[model samples]
Target: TPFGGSLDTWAITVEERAKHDQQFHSLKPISGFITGDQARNFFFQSGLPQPVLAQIWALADMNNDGRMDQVEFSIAMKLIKLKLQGYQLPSALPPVMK
Candidate 1:
């Protein structure tokens, strides 16, 4: 498969993906998919350091298009939550060699 069985094995259906994007964008149309500088900005807003942002962006940008979709963001949220609770997680995804 892709990498670890953590998030890679969990699939979000197209309808679900679209609904999440739509819901978020509907709340604020300007908040497009979290990608590129947007993801970094979110990390900053969340008070996470730059180094961690880099690591997360690499893993969460599944399409390797420099941005994270709704599903990817979900993966990131889970990862961040685990980390914050001091729980060690398995590798969540394949490494993106920048």
Candidate 2:
């Protein structure tokens, strides 16, 4: 329950978070998705907002084959940023993450 309880707290602190405005808006934190099935054992569960999940699924229907590969699922996150905030795709890390 500690991780569930502790993770309830956002990973980014208020100070650092405030420094990154657009990134904050584009992110739902790691809390966005239910990483695994830790939820059923307790009173809490986590997942991306319903809308975000829907968007992910929509993107998954690539090649019009109606399926998402691991690559597609991961790309969907970046695409979401593109659509939402015009985030540019980095060929590499933006220096800070590196």
Candidate 3:
């Protein structure tokens, strides 16, 4: 649960996320949709509880395609930052999460 800086200080820029997202787009062996088994891959490191991860996936996959494009992935990370900042996920799941 602990990560660097406060939630407000979470400074992952769009370009920064774009760079990381490209890695996923390019490497199917490691990253891609969070379907049946990829959620536990260390590359994604999304060690959230299964329900939390599921909630994130639901809110983040903007197209309902069971995958995250760069923008969705980026927004998910921001909401997670807020979550780690002590915001309740139930209350703070942003409208953008849709």
TM-score of each: 0.55, 0.29, 0.51
lDDT of 3 by residue, 1-98 (tens): 36543444445666657765765565463344544244224223654566665566555566766555556666666555555566556533344333
For model 1, residues 1-98, the per-residue Cα lDDT tens digits are 33434442344446655665564464342445654676566655556566765676666777788866666665565455444655444455634211
lDDT agreement with native, every candidate: 0.56, 0.36, 0.53
Clashing pairs in 1: 35-67
RMSD of each: 6.3, 15.2, 6.0
Task: Name the candidate, 1 or 2, with the larger lDDT value.
Answer: 1
- Candidate 1's C-alpha lDDT? 0.56
Q: What's the lDDT for candidate 2? A: 0.36
> Model 2, 1-98: lDDT tens per residue?
43322332223334543444333334333433322221111112123344544544454334445443333333444444443553333332222221
Clashing pairs in 2: 32-48
lDDT of 3: 0.53
Which runs of model 2 end up more than 4 angstroms from their true locations? 1-46, 79-98
lDDT over C-alpha atoms for residue 45 of model 3: 61
Q: Which stretches of candidate 1 lie over 4 Å from their true place?
A: 1-32, 88-98
